[PDB]
Symmetry: C2
Subunit: 410 residues, 2 copies
């Protein structure tokens, strides 16, 4: 195997799917919606499938109708003109976008800052570019009194400074955050922008859950903050925008001198994406660009729908003294499990507690989730290993089944 990939062959995120394969279990694990996508997203596929051209190659950098749509959606959010051809790159997921960003922008020996826990591909994505990932964790503050929330987690600004050096090339920001659910604040974003400008680094901002933010919170885009347009790549996703995780396209959006470089990675990698998916996506974005101010719009209705289910899931969790972190955004909830009956002394690896715990819960209670340590670097895992992550972008009947389970815990 070539050197750029030594020790990056880690899938336990296969195991977590072995686990869940047994069909009398309730899968609250991987981030797999089981609600219907919006009809008209399905309709538009079918319609693109019957148009010959749409089954043939389109533009490398993104189907013109898709980037036209994007440029006008994000145009509105940025409060500024976004240039469909030079400032957008369409890629294979947000996943490929992160890859474009890092591969196009990051060199052997460079430092990339990663806030722990992270979406798990950041790390390995950095090591493959031959760069040094540099970790700093989220830490929790005292509560309000009532609930534990996503907002109760933050970073220490001074600790953050201390991470930047002449070697820092970039920092990777994920907001809404996976797995926390944290929606960053304008104060929290301005500490990070301060340092990127102060230090002339980039920022890769992974905002695929931009629409999924709940009440009391707001998505702010660090790329809109003074000095950051020039230095930010902001990445979005079809899959999370429209609950069609299987469509795998996403977008990078930022300046031409940066999206230049992303563009060359894509050109020399896979070249182009699928045409019908993009054609149909572009229609969906249109269907939904035009009603932004209505609640019929998917950008509004979805998060309204998911908030109810978030709340139903905290309660469920609470009802066994799993200790939930009410998230501000996205569609995962994390729960401390330690106050339950530590039950695992007779499982005899040295996997972290949460792997062992999630295994136990899978065996005994018939529910799976994701151990938070999966989202952590190795020196980081012990500070996170009583934490376990559940996903709620599910249909009632699934939350029903899980309701069934939690009721009969003891």
């Amino acid at each position: 195997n070539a050197k750029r990939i030594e020790g990056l062959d880690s899938n336990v995120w296969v195991e977590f799917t072995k686990l869940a394969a047994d069909p009398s279990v309730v899968n609250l694990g991987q981030g797999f919606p089981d609600i219907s996508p919006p009809s008209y997203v399905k309709e538009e596929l079918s319609k693109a499938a019957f148009i010959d051209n749409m089954n043939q190659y389109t533009r490398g950098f993104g189907h013109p109708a898709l980037v036209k749509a994007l440029s006008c959606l994000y145009g509105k959010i940025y409060q500024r003109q976004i240039d469909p051809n030079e400032e957008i790159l369409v890629a294979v997921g947000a996943y490929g976008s992160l890859f474009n960003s890092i591969q196009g922008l990051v060199d052997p020996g460079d430092e990339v800052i990663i806030m722990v826990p992270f979406y798990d591909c950041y790390e390995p994505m950095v090591r493959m570019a031959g760069a040094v990932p540099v970790f700093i964790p989220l830490r929790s503050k005292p509560t309000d009194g009532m609930k534990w929330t996503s907002s109760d987690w933050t970073f220490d600004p001074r600790e953050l400074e201390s991470k930047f050096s002449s070697k820092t090339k970039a920092i990777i920001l994920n907001t809404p955050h996976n797995p926390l659910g944290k929606v960053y604040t304008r104060q929290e974003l301005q500490v990070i922008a301060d340092l990127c400008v102060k230090h002339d680094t980039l920022c890769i901002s992974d905002e695929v859950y931009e629409w999924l933010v709940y009440t009391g919170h707001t998505h702010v885009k660090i790329a809109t903050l003074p000095g950051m347009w020039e230095r930010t790549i902001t990445i979005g996703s079809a899959g999370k925008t429209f609950s069609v995780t299987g469509w795998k396209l996403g977008w990078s959006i930022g300046p031409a001198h940066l999206i230049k470089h992303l563009q060359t990675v894509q050109q020399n990698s896979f070249y182009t994406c699928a045409t019908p998916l993009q054609a149909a996506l572009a229609e969906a974005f249109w269907i939904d660009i035009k009603r932004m101010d209505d609640p019929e719009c998917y950008f509004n209705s979805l998060p309204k729908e998911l908030e109810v289910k978030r709340d139903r899931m905290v309660r469920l969790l609470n009802s066994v003294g799993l200790k939930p972190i009410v998230p501000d955004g996205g569609y995962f909830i994390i729960a401390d499990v330690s106050s339950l009956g530590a039950d695992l002394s007779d499982m005899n690896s040295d996997e972290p507690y949460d792997y062992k715990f999630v295994k136990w819960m899978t065996k005994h209670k018939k529910l799976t989730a994701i151990p938070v340590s999966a989202f952590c670097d190795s020196k980081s895992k012990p500070h996170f290993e009583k934490l376990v992550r559940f996903c709620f972008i599910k249909k009632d009947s699934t939350l029903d089944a899980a309701e069934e389970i939690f009721r009969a815990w003891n």
Copy 2:
């Protein structure tokens, strides 16, 4: 802009798509079927669209139905039990497969051998892995007196042998060849396997047009030669197979200890591929696999529709003094251009003769084509720049419109 991508951002093909700016030209340049896809290919895409589960994530290394069908198709071909999870990987086109193969197997400073002219990604992919492309031209043999054909082009075994050394990681082999349309012979495939075996190198084999062989030729897979299974990666295409160029789905078939490395690249790049494209393809495949021996099998009915379009195209090319090279396979025809009017004083700013001619024929005849020099290392262009590539996977209307142009060529 990362060192890995230093100058790798030239896309001469943006400029070509400029010439295929209508103003009403018959566009014979780029591999862009404008026949319709098979009707059931389209049918299954929509069926898929309406199933909710086929819009969500699937096996990262390949939709399971799909790797099942690949395994059963290619096991029929290889004469062997091919393991659908460990010997296949589904990637974003052949294009992504090559990328996988190179990134996951080639190190900085390895040498990779490439046949000129070559599908034009080969060079930048190798260069992006920091390896050194080593080139060796295809050369003409005396013709049989009657016609120029792709098999009048071959390699010198002794020249090839001398390109191997101890830095050679691999040779990239493409058959049927793009752009010659050459179907490598057993004898030629044998010389490569000898050198691979004796030198312990890999062969990455690009066989996307593998079903497009015309009368008097068979596709033989080097991976099936004694000793080549263990050293070969062999790549196929949904785009080329089903005439759906915009679906960008390809696959690598080969031994576990090689696939795992491609799997690793794929897992740290794009991860999973569109569920719905892959659901539908699987069913496209099953449909054709059950009629392999029948003339309705798309695998049989396509080459045969095409041979006729080819022979139509040779006539037309001859009609007009463009000396064509009848291809044994694939759907491009190359034509020697040298002996018309040379006619190009408007220009000769000396970028390559073929480019100037393609520009001319666009302006004055409203036919576009692709200058073969564009598939050549810089040191090779002079040997190939009177050569021009035309595409013939075209509907009758389109070839019709081509007749009117050659017919009027005079």
